[PDB]
Amino acid sequence: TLVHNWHLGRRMEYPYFESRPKHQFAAVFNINRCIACQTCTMACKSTWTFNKGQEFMWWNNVETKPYGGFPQSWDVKTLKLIDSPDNIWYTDDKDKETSQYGTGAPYGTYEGDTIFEVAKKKNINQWAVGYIPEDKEWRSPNFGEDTAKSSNQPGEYSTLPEHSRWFFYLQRICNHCTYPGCLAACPRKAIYKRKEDGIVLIDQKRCRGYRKCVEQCPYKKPMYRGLTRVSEKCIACYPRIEGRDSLTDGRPMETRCMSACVGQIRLQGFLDDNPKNPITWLIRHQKIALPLYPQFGTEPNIYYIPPRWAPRAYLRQMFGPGVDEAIEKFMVPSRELLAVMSLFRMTQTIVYEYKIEEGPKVFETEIHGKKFTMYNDTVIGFGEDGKEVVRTTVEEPIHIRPDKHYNSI
C-alpha cells in the first residue's frame, strides 16, 4: 500500500492504508534555547515510569549530539541499516505553495529508501529494518553529555556561522508518527493510532511482549517492562490533553513533559489546516521547525528549530534540507516570529490560535548582515472555543519606585 508522506515529498510503502487523524498532536522545540536541564525528563519519570520494572525507562530524554544518545548510539545504529548512496534529497520541485493539512512536498523529494522500503527490497520478511537494544545499551541515559566534536587542530576556536568545536541538545519523546514503525511491527495490531488527536498507544490489555515495536521503531521509544512482561511507550499524557486535569478547568492541557520545559523551548498543540494556529504556522507556513530524521519514513510530529551554530551538513542529514532557511529566519527574527516565540511556555493550557496586538518599537540594529527591528507587541493565545487563555508582552516593563528604596544594597 503506497501512502503519501509530505516530509519526503513522495509516496511511501506502509502495511496499512493512509488514514490521518482529524488533527495531529505536534510540538515545536527551539533547540537554540535548550539548556539540557532534563526537567522534561523528570516530568515524565515522576509521573509514568517511576515504578518497578521501568527503572531504565526514560520516555523523555535530552541527549547531547552528536556523540550522545539513549539508547547508546541509537541514531548511528539505525542509520547504518539504511545506508545507501541513493539517500539523496532533491529540492528544485519543492512546493512553493503551502499545501493543505497532510499533503504536499515542502522540503523536496527524498529518493532514498525508508526503513519499510529497505525491508521490502531485501525481502527480509519483516515490516521494517531494526534491532532490539540490549539491556546494556539502555544504560547511561546521559551518554555523551556535553561531549563536543573537535577539529583537533591547535588553533581551534568557535565562531558563527558554524562552530569548529560544537555540540547541541536533542530533546526526544515518542514522535507519535503518522506512519509509526511500532504500529506496523506489532502482529497483534495491539498498537493503534487515535484518529481524534493522533496519539499512538500500546494496548496494555492485549500486548503480549512481542518486542517487535521495540525492534522496528527507529527512535527506540517502545520499551519492554520486565515486571509486566509487556512493552510500554510514551502516551502523550492523553488524560491531560483530554482535559482531565482540573487545573486547566476541562480545557486540553499540554502534556506533562512540555509544561515542564524551563528554557521556554517547546510549544505543544495540534497540526491543523489553520494558519492562525501557532503550531501549524511554524511548521508549514514558516518551515522553521523540522522533523527528526525524516529519512526513517515514519513522519515524526515533533519539529525542531535547528541550532544556529552547528555544522549545516550534520543538520541537513538530521532535519532534512529545510535547515538553511529555518536558521536564516531565526537568527534575525521577523516581527511575527519573535511574538510567536514569546508565546512559548507562557501557560499550561493548549493554545489553538494566536493573534497579536501591536506595540511601540523598542530597539533596532543591523545584525548578521541584515536589519533587525523589535517592537513591544502583545501576543495573545486562544483556546478551543476562541476564548483567550494567555497573553504576554515581547519586552519587559520597567518600574521606578520612591527614592527611599535602593538598588545598590
Binding site: 518497578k52 518486542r211 520499551m223 515486571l227
Partner: protein, 292 residues
C-alpha cells in the same frame, strides 16, 4: 496480503498418522509432576510430529526445532498430552529486554468438524468464523510458580539493582501502599493482563480465529507441568475432558478431532510467528472407556 503467503494445499490436508489417546486409569497426586505421569505415558504410543520454520507470514522465524514427540492418555475425566522436543538451552524467564521464553502450544478446532481441501479449515491458528482453542505453555510461568509472590520480579534478573522507593528498607506504610498500589503500578498489572499477574498457572487457555487474532480467555481451564533435562524439554498438558466454557474444546471418549502443534526457542528469539510450527492438522482419536 503483503505480509502473508497463500494457503498451500499441503497445509489444508490433514496428516495421515493418527494420535490415539489411550484409556488408562491415571493415579496421580495433588501436585502433578512429569515424573508422576511418566509411568502412564510409557504404555501409550506417540506420534512424531515434524516442525518447520514459520515462513508463511510476517514475521518469519523459527527453525531451531525440527521434530516433537506427542503422546496422550485420558481418565474418562481428565485428558493429558505429553510433548517432547530437543533444545540445548533452558530459557526460563523473559524479564530482560533481549531475553525470551521457551514455549510450546497445542491447538484444537472448537466443535466437531472434518477438514479437507473441499471443506478447508486453515491450520494457521484457525481462520475467520472458524475459531480455535489454544493451550500455550510458558517456561517462565513454571519459574513464576516457584517465586515467593507467584511471579518473578526484577531483582531476580538484576540482583545488584537499587531503587529509592522499591528497594528502601525504611519505606513508610502509606507511601509504599500508594506507590505499589495496582493503579500506580499501571500497565498489565493495572489492566489485569495475565502476563503481568501471578496466574498460579503454567499454561494459558486462549482462543484464536486466525493469526494476528490470538485472544486470552477470561476463564482459564488448562494447566500443566514441565521438566528440562540433558538438552531436552518434556511438557505435559492437563485439562478436564469437558469444561463449562463454551469457547473450550470438548473431548468425548470415542470421538475423534484434529490438533496442531508449535514450539518456541527463546535462544533464537522466538515469540509470535517466529514459532517452530507444524504445517498440517493432525488427526486425534479418543478411545472408549473400559466400563467395568
Amino acid at each position: 496480503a503483503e505480509g502473508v503467503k497463500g494457503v498451500a494445499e499441503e497445509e489444508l490436508t490433514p496428516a495421515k498418522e493418527v494420535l490415539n489417546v489411550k484409556y488408562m486409569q491415571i493415579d496421580v497426586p495433588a501436585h502433578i509432576t512429569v515424573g508422576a505421569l511418566e509411568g502412564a505415558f510409557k504404555n501409550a504410543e506417540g506420534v512424531q510430529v515434524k516442525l518447520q520454520k514459520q515462513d508463511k507470514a510476517f514475521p518469519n522465524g523459527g527453525g531451531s526445532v525440527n521434530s516433537a514427540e506427542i503422546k496422550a492418555i485420558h481418565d474418562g475425566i481428565t485428558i493429558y498430552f505429553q510433548v517432547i522436543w530437543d533444545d540445548a538451552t533452558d530459557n526460563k524467564q523473559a524479564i530482560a529486554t533481549q531475553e525470551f521464553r521457551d514455549g510450546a502450544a497445542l491447538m484444537f478446532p472448537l466443535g466437531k468438524i472434518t477438514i479437507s481441501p473441499e471443506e478447508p479449515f486453515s491450520p494457521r491458528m484457525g481462520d475467520r468464523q472458524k475459531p480455535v482453542n489454544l493451550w500455550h505453555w510458558k517456561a517462565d510461568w513454571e519459574a513464576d510458580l516457584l517465586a515467593t509472590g507467584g511471579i518473578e520480579e526484577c531483582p531476580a534478573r538484576y540482583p545488584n539493582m537499587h531503587d529509592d522507593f522499591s528497594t528502601n528498607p525504611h519505606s513508610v506504610n502509606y507511601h509504599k501502599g500508594v506507590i505499589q498500589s495496582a493503579a500506580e503500578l499501571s500497565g498489565g498489572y493495572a489492566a489485569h493482563n495475565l502476563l503481568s499477574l501471578p496466574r498460579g498457572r503454567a499454561v494459558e487457555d486462549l482462543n484464536a480465529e486466525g493469526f494476528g487474532t490470538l485472544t486470552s480467555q477470561d476463564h482459564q481451564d488448562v494447566d500443566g507441568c514441565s521438566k528440562f533435562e540433558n538438552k531436552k524439554w518434556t511438557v505435559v498438558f492437563c485439562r478436564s475432558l469437558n469444561t463449562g466454557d463454551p469457547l473450550d474444546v470438548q473431548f468425548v471418549p470415542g470421538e475423534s478431532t484434529y490438533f496442531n502443534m508449535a514450539v518456541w526457542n527463546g535462544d533464537r528469539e522466538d515469540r509470535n510467528g517466529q514459532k517452530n510450527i507444524s504445517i498440517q492438522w493432525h488427526p486425534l482419536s479418543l478411545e472408549r472407556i473400559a466400563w467395568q
